Amino acid sequence: DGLTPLQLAAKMGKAEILKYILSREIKEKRLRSLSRKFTDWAYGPVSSSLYDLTNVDTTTDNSVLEITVYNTNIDNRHEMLTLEPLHTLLHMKWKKFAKHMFFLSFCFYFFYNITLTLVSYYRPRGWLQLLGRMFVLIWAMCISVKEGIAIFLLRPSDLQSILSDAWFHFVFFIQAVLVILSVFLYLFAYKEYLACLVLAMALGWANMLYY
Amino acid sequence: RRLKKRIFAAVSEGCVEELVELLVELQELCRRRHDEDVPDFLMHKLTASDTGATCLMKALLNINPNTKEIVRILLAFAEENDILGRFINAEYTEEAYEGQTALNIAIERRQGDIAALLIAAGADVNAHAKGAFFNPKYQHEGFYFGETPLALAACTNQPEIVQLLMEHEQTDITSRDSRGNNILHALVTVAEDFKTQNDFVKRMYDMILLRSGNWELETTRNNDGLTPLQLAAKMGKAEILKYILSREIKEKRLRSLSRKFTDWAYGPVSSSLYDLTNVDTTTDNSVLEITVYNTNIDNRHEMLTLEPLHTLLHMKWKKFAKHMFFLSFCFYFFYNITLTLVSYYRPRGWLQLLGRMFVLIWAMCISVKEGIAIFLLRPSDLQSILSDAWFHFVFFIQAVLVILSVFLYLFAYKEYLACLVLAMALGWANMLYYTRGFQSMGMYSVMIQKVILHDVLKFLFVYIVFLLGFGVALASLIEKCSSYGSFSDAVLELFKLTIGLGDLNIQQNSKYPILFLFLLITYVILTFVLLLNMLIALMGETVENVSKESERIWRLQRARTILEFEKMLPEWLRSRFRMGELRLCLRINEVKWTEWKTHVSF
Amino acid sequence: ETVENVSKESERIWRLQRARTILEFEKMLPEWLRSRFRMGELRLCLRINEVKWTEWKTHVSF
């Protein structure tokens, strides 16, 4: 299956073996390349070290951090993530860019829901609702194609039965296809568009709790 | 360029033949001189240029089990070139590790006999490792020990090296660092507030004070002006505070250092005299004031439950503070009663002025008192913690409300009734603060604060999203002419439906009544069954966490009331100190039955 | 009973949800402007530093 023993312990969830392998420190010479934790200096309680990242980073295709985060059939994932050099890697990758990207996506979804509510409320039962209706249309198209790719990538259909993050992709895709179907029914002659618009508007605020 | 790397690898390897052959090579290099200078060029070739580390320091960072001959012949090589006097006190030059000598690393690397050889060869003990690493901004950014070799040997649990240092003549014990802290402050900052199986720092502080045998170590204020007792009170160190506040030593010539003179004992009944040089509000800054107004600790009740703080708070309570608290409660009760009578029995005169003047003057007094108490609160960080930051705000808001309403009554505007009735509605919710006096009521008045700040605000921050979403989703599809008129009415109907009033009639003026009924049923299932009962379960968890514990917070609220009323008393008629001198020497007596039972039981 | 079983534990699940958010946004970043690797070679050799006060307390306490 193309797995390093480190990756196999990460797949099957073996905390003590992973702790030993991720911090392997041997002092005597001619056994130095086997070690992975070169300690630089120490002064009482403050110490500083160099860890190896041959597998424990997302630079490769399959990797230890990716396996131990996307793994679902174990129950000691926090006990495996709370140890170096996975924890500070997640922390540095958070405070480098991911906080800014999360806040950006949150502001875009907030503006999308605000314009959807204003369009679906201040309706004459034009000249300004197109300015904003195009934005709702293009961000609905973006969200549905993103959720469609993320669902079609979910091939084996077994990870849905576990709680972790299998629901919000479905609800985002359902809201996007609802607002797309409602603007199509508005462009056609049928006046049953109000139900499929108001269901999208009611779901668009229950989407926000994910943020 | 070649030799420096060779001997720096040789001192890390430990091969002594390489050491002596580069020794005689450098000796030939420094007997045939290029006529620049011998000693500083010897130091330049021996030491690194970027960091300042010596071969001695590089040997000491890389301690091998055969380093004794290495350091012996290295100091011998420094002796033959008579460079040892300005060599053994070498130090780093970078700004992070500035001034760190080889003696510090000899002490830190647990090498007692090597450190004894280092101090025997004439090292410097008055060093100050004043780098930015040694005193960082916070705790988890470095290692603080007082940048003194004696203090480092103290905090790193090396009592024989402490004994070797305090017997030496040049080691000035009370020398303060860049922070202004001596060895006792260093031990307090190192000390741990959890009673483990062993605490070396208390025995270290004990033996250091017993070896010094005089009061100048205890009395030296730091740069922030703190006794070590006050520093332990500031940082919250319970065992160190317990040892210092009851220090009892029996043998003579160590008697002035003690603070607990026991008078007599008879079985379990004992009687003692404690000292009150710092543990009283007579000074400006003080231990009791610090350990009560301290906010960033969580063992304040464990620090207050020990003598002579507890009986001092008890005596200061039952002397005057109960009477002053009851007096303030009666005045606030009369103020609220007259405010309610004035704001109720209104003709929409001849008697409401008699009482309206009293409301006006007590409103002025309360607002200027709360304004002084808020303007004294300068740094604006203590508000984020629960303790007593709210009631000053609510008292000031009620006072400015009743003042603004009587001003609007004296003017021509008739919008005064809202700003009067808000003051009247707030004046009774103010009264629950006066339920901190009893025991079975303060634990009911702090639970409102805990539940409001933890659960109800979070639940409303979630629930407002559902309310807005379903309010727009129901007010959108109502065909215009009914009941679900606009957004400012559908949310009223949904709040009535959430609290259990109103109606759920299907016959509405909509285009899709099945969809309208489905949205209403989804809202009732989402909030009436799921969310509100989940809030009830979380509030049950909060009440279970609080009611086992909050006697501590009631005692703390009462102690803050003690110190605030004592500050409110003036210096005139403060004839309520404790005891004449023997140093005020407060007298207590007590019963210790269980320790007496276990001691007589053997 | 369910809320009592969850609220003592679910900090783990919040940390796990945040870590899944990290890796999903890192997958959403393209290879272009992925100049955010860790450290030059010495094998990438990531450098950390830390404070271990309690094990230091128990070790210096003997």
Curated annotation (Swiss-Prot), chain A:
Membrane-spanning ranges: 92-121, 126-154, 166-186, 192-211
A single GO BP: calcium ion transmembrane transport
ANK repeats: 1-23, 59-81
GO terms under cellular component: cilium; cytoplasm; lysosome; plasma membrane; receptor complex
Chief localization: membrane
Tissues in which the protein is found: Abundantly expressed in CNS. Widely expressed at low levels. Detected in dorsal root ganglion (at protein level). Expressed in the keratinocyte layers of the outer root sheath and, to lesser extent, to the matrix of the hair follicles (at protein level).
Cytoplasmic side: 155-165
Superkingdom to which the source organism belongs: Eukaryota
Extracellular side: 187-191
Function, as annotated: Non-selective calcium permeant cation channel. It is activated by innocuous (warm) temperatures and shows an increased response at noxious temperatures greater than 39 degrees Celsius. Activation exhibits an outward rectification. The channel pore can dilate to provide permeability to larger cations. May associate with TRPV1 and may modulate its activity. Is a negative regulator of hair growth and cycling: TRPV3-coupled signaling suppresses keratinocyte proliferation in hair follicles and induces apoptosis and premature hair follicle regression (catagen).
Name recorded for this polypeptide: Transient receptor potential cation channel subfamily V member 3
Section covered of the full-length record: 340 to 565 of 790
UniProtKB/Swiss-Prot annotation, chain B:
Keyword Cell membrane recorded: yes
Keyword Cytoplasm included in the entry's annotation: yes
Molecular function GO terms recorded: calcium channel activity; identical protein binding; metal ion binding; sodium channel activity
Control of this protein's activity: Activated by cannabinoid that binds to the vanilloid binding pocket. Diphenylboronic anhydride induces pore dilation and enhances cation permeability by promoting the conversion to a homopentamer.
Protein family: Belongs to the transient receptor (TC 1.A.4) family. TrpV subfamily. TRPV3 sub-subfamily.
Subunit (UniProt): Homotetramer. May convert from a homotetramer to a homopentamer to allow pore dilation. Interacts with TRPV1; may form a heteromeric channel with TRPV1. Interacts with SNX11; this interaction promotes TRPV3 trafficking from the cell membrane to lysosome for degradation.
The name this protein goes by in its record: Transient receptor potential cation channel subfamily V member 3
Organism this protein belongs to: Homo sapiens (Human)
Gene name, Swiss-Prot/TrEMBL: TRPV3
